[PDB]
Design a protein around this nucleic acid. Sequence first.
RNA 1: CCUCUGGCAUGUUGGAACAAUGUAGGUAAGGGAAGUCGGCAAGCCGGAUCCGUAACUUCGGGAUAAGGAUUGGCUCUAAGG
RNA 2: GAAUGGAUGAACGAGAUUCCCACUGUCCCUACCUACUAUCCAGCGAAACCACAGCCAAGGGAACGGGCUUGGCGGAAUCAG
RNA 3: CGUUCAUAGCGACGUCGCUUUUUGAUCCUUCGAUGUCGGCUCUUCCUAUCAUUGUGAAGCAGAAUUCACCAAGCGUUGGAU
RNA 4: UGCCAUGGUAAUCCUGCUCAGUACGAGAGGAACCGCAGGUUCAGACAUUUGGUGUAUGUGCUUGGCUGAGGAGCCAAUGGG
RNA 5: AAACUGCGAAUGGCUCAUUAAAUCAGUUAUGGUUCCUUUGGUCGCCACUUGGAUAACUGUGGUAAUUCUAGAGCUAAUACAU
RNA 6: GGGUGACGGGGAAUCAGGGUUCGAUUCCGGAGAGGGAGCCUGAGAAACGGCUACCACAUCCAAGGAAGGCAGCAGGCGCGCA
Lengths: 577, 131, 178, 63
Amino acid sequence: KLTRIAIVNHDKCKPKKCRQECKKSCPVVRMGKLCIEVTPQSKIAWISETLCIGCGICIKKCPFGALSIVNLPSNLEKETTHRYCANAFKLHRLPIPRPGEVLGLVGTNGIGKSTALKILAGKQKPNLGKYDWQEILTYFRGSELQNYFTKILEDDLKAIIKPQYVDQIPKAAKGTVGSILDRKDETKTQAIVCQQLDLTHLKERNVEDLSGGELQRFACAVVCIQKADIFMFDEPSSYLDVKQRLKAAITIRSLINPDRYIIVVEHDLSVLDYLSDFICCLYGVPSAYGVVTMPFSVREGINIFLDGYVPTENLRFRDASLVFMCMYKYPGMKKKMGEFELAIVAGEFTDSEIMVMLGENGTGKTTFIRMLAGRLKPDEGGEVPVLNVSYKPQKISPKSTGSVRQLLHEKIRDAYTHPQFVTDVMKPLQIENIIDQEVQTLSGGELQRVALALCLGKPADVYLIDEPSAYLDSEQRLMAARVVKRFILHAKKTAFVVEHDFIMATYLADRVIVFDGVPSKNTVANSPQTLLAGMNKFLSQLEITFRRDPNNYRPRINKLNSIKDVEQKKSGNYFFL
Amino acid sequence: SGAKFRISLGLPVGAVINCADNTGAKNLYIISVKGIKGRLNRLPAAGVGDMVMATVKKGKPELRKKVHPAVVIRQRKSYRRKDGVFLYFEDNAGVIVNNKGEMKGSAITGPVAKECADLWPRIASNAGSIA
Amino acid sequence: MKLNISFPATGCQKLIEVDDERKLRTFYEKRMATEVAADALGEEWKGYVVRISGGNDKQGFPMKQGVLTHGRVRLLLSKGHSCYRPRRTGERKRKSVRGCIVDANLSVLNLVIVKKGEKDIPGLTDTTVPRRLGPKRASRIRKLFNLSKEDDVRQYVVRKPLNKEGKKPRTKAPKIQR
Amino acid sequence: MKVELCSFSGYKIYPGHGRRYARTDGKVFQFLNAKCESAFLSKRNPRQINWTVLYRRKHKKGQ
RNA sequence: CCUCUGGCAUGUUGGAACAAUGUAGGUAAGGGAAGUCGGCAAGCCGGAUCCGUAACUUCGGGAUAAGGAUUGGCUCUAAGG
RNA sequence: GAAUGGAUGAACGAGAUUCCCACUGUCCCUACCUACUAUCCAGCGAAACCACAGCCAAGGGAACGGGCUUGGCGGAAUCAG
RNA sequence: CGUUCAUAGCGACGUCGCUUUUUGAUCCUUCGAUGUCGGCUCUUCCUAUCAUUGUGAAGCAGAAUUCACCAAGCGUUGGAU
RNA sequence: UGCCAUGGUAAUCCUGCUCAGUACGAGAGGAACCGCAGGUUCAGACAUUUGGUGUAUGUGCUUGGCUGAGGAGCCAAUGGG
RNA sequence: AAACUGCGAAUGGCUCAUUAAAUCAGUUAUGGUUCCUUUGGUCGCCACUUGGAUAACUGUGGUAAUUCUAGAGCUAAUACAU
RNA sequence: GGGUGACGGGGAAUCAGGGUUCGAUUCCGGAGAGGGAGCCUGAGAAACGGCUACCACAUCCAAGGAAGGCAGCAGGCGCGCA
Ligand SMILES: Nc1ncnc2c1ncn2[C@@H]1O[C@H](COP(=O)(O)OP(=O)(O)O)[C@@H](O)[C@H]1O
Ligand SMILES: Nc1ncnc2c1ncn2[C@@H]1O[C@H](COP(=O)(O)OP(=O)(O)O)[C@@H](O)[C@H]1O
Ligand code: SF4
Ligand code: SF4
Ligand SMILES: [Mg+2]
Ligand SMILES: [Mg+2]
Ligand SMILES: [Mg+2]
Ligand SMILES: [Mg+2]
Ligand SMILES: [Mg+2]
Ligand SMILES: [Mg+2]
Ligand SMILES: [Mg+2]
Ligand SMILES: [Mg+2]
Ligand SMILES: [Mg+2]
Ligand SMILES: [Mg+2]
Ligand SMILES: [Mg+2]
Ligand SMILES: [Mg+2]
Ligand SMILES: [Mg+2]
Ligand SMILES: [Mg+2]
Ligand SMILES: [Mg+2]
Ligand SMILES: [Mg+2]
Ligand SMILES: [Mg+2]
Ligand SMILES: [Mg+2]
Ligand SMILES: [Mg+2]
Ligand SMILES: [Mg+2]
Ligand SMILES: [Mg+2]
Ligand SMILES: [Mg+2]
């Protein structure tokens, strides 16, 4: 029981430049059949996946890499919930949103996640692989889906989407933060939401002046204000800091009424865990097809995701299960602005080391990073190391019109060719697939992959890494983490990682530097502590504890004054290992 | 990463430990222990948490008259844990398994020794009670 | 242990966090409804007597008197029992309770202050919230104000003024029954 | 080093000594020594055995 | 197996030790014939009462087939001349 | 291969095989205990066997030497094994 | 032969050797007797090296591998008939 | 209290983690050194613990008998447990 | 509103697994019994009216989690008592 | 004793007179609520849109615990000619 799916990448497939091609090389067409239809004219090539052998010839011939042929199980053909065009993506099933329960979708991008969100919003009618509302409702019977859609169709439920792409919001709306919130009032609960998400300082400022983390807080606060059912949340944690992303989770959990459906989408697994009560995985071949699993528990669903093995379907979807000398010395530097007093403790910086930076969005991780670089100048003291440095920023725009190939050779030709770099950075971050695309038409994750590659390739002693996990898929995150580790192990060049994810921080950390104190006030940057002690200080400052599920040892988040939390605080082991 | 430590092993080749999974096998006649070089005259022996080639001696005839890998899960011979506690299990038992460590059954009746559970994660997941 | 201490003669009660085994060692391995002296607890509570009515086990499971042990026992309960509200006429249900005996294996202890010694405390003996409503049955009205049958119960009755109604406060009173 | 109580006698069991028994019902018993273990296995009710704690509790000995 | 009547002085010697090999007895964690030509050797079984008893059969048997239960001490009751 | 009897066959057999259940130190893998020995002493006291005798390697030799040749070497008297 | 190439690995027709873990020849020794198969138990020696150490070779990309060298230190098992 | 001629002599091999899905490879597949955690076989000990033994003939319990009974005991090749 | 009190929740609805002098049907007995309710009969020194308890309400909570509940305040009855 | 493609009946279908077959199925009676058992309340239940066990299925768990019963009506899966 196996069938095939043809896919034609409509951006890449240009029938005029290439000529007919496919037809000439296809053995079904050379026989004399309607396997492929093209001509020099017309846009996009069509393939009959019925008549198609799946010889894998047409893909090798086509000059752009426009064609793909994948193999999907024949079980899925019955349970197709959407297909937009012929030779395009094929979504199977939909997640099962439950009223008064936060749905947690988990799964990598390009697996029909966006189309599902649109369907559940009610923008997209499920064409059901036909390319109807009574027919659609009959298809969805015996399940809460028919309940959901019936609710949508007569009682006009308001679909609201916290978007993925946050940097496009500034270039659309205008005025202050406080003004937009005042305009969008329906519940009339500005103050409480602002105290939860800390928008007391930010109310005065404009939208363009905000950082990434503050923009997220703003966008979530806006969605919380709007009176609506069916809340779609797409990566709220990305750009945020540890305590900010927990507060954002708490706010979203507070939005639960028995009326409202909520559908979060998190890639930080500990945050997703905290958010949801109900989870649905999204496995498939990226860009070709996608399957929405049956709804598991929070715990069970994420274990299934880590195993890469759905026990009920019995489909091992992923191959592998994703489970868990001194260079220089800075002295006691102090940098007083006038009202604000930034401080440093003395310590070492051993080569082949990744220093993780624990703190907050405001404690001035970015400002310290700029100071270390030379991009910021000293008020007092004077950090002027005779050292080349590289700087992966938070906010990543594509304002350099061309191809990724051009970007790579313009910045760094040697690294771009070098095999040790290529095995370490290009291949694992699937840069071989991005290479041909334009820089304008990147996604957010793809831009983050390119950023990682650009800064690793540029030679230095220090490598600054602000938010590598931002936008990347949980798999990609863990790859990006491995890439940074190995690159540094080969190079013997130190790095510094601003992360707000306890999965990635525990993964990367050899030594860990901690920041203390509130932002825009006195920052006491401690000496590089060992990992064991370092996280415990950081967790004690933010008042969180974790634990580990014996199957995959994944860090789960605790409740305040829960017995397990209290025990861990008394011991001093705020998490494990 | 953390290796096994030796434990007093009282299931020599010839033992019939009772199958404690939902396969349909009742018994498991141990015909050899895996990872035993051995000596002259010495019967190979499997403790808890050992791999073992077994034959099913009574149960469903799908399983009978062929060899399976299995894992010893409980054992009546008292083994010592590093923390100085001796521990024994009221019955000898096991589960039918494949070469790569996955269970061919689905649910383990009774407790699984933690020596075995730490070593065999897929058994441990199905195991209701440990130690 | 999250000690829930209640001074009954006022009408005020606090939640007091306590740590250090030796601080709580006076309470441990004692029964429910025993009157323990709280002097070893702290010099704030100098010569205080506290009755130990037995709050809640960790894992949420209330102590119920009679069962003894310091562990959980599960019992068949009925109408006229602790730890159980029956949802049907002659409903009956199995529910796990916990030992009368006090141990560190506990989330809360419940303590009722029987006698205060010399000192006072800020959110307990200072504060004095009244009995929420006065007598309602006639006999209890007579007993409150010392009347006898030949004295008119109507006049010597408790009455509560409900201000911030909107317009004006009613000088409100119950219906005297019996 | 959690000192455990013997499931038969009632004596405390220090780290080094004793023996642990994990019956297939899925509940475990500690034994101070073999005397206790044998008694538990032969099904002797420790409330009828004068040297066990349980007996002394029942019969109100000491105090 | 223990005792009285009657009869003996331990079977052609004593003492001191308590090594190995033996001869004759015992007991053994977990496994249970993997031992060996071969269950050799030992071990299980065992009395009685009450149930219950297959194939086959020369219809006699097989048959204590197999397989179960009970059994002490004490204080009474009933039934048998 | 058919009273040099053929084919059968209940019951029986210290008869010859094979398997299963139970049981077990037969074994994994051995350990500990008891008695009588062995052991030391008092007393008593045999036999078989004996060319001479009594450490080896190799050589040659009636073609596997304790003895011969060439080397290695050799230290009273004895005890239990 | 090995796509090609006698010799990486092989190797016909021929030819030269070693070995006494085969079996024959032979009949020297022993017929006034050297206890006649196997298994068990135990030690030691050899190398004509299966594994392990260090290496040279390939028709050795890796993995797997055969070919060869130093080499006998250490190993070389449990069962069914 | 010591020296040391001469004899003897001993350690073994494996797995897991890591390197790493890395080198190499079109891909399929797929290594290695240094580390770390443990195991096999062998050797030499030892008894804190778990186990075995147990005639301290230690202390209960019990069968048959025997000291008139009670009590205290004994016998039954170690009465049995 | 709530909460205690009382009543109902044994009807209805579904199915036909079982069950063969059993179910079941006609026939009769209860002089061999129970029966909420309905309907009718009965109902010769705190009484100028007694006791204290609790729920809702108030307020501390505990548990990851349930139509979980605990401790402290009160306050009624045709509830529970005399 | 075994079987029943057996819930009983009223009735249904064929039919000259006889019969033959069917009756899960709207009225009456029974029995049952995955399987067995036990019981609280109550006038009435050995109730299951009541509880307590076990078995068999299955659901969250922060793994200490907690909850469950469509042969009601819709609907799903499955079984299937239906
Ligand atoms: N309107 C459209 N018309 C044709 N092709 C589309 C359209 N929208 C998306 N696609 C194609 O579908 C692919 C996946 O898109 P989508 O399913 O929206 O993303 P995701 O899989 O993350 O949900 C894209 O690569 C794109 O080429
Ligand atoms: N060159 C500069 N001149 C003036 N103000 C600056 C400059 N660089 C940074 N800042 C101010 O410093 C603040 C914090 O800097 P930023 O890098 O945004 O830190 P974070 O991302 O943690 O908020 C900003 O609000 C910004 O206005
Ligand atoms: S794959 Fe299907 S379509 Fe593309 S060439 Fe081979 S056959 Fe023709
Ligand atoms: S497929 Fe590649 S080749 Fe065939 S037409 Fe579209 S582009 Fe030209
Ligand atoms: Mg052998
Ligand atoms: Mg004698
Ligand atoms: Mg004599
Ligand atoms: Mg004589
Ligand atoms: Mg034995
Ligand atoms: Mg053999
Ligand atoms: Mg054999
Ligand atoms: Mg015999
Ligand atoms: Mg017979
Ligand atoms: Mg003849
Ligand atoms: Mg003949
Ligand atoms: Mg001679
Ligand atoms: Mg040729
Ligand atoms: Mg001889
Ligand atoms: Mg050689
Ligand atoms: Mg006596
Ligand atoms: Mg039938
Ligand atoms: Mg009916
Ligand atoms: Mg019924
Ligand atoms: Mg059913
Ligand atoms: Mg019932
Ligand atoms: Mg129902």
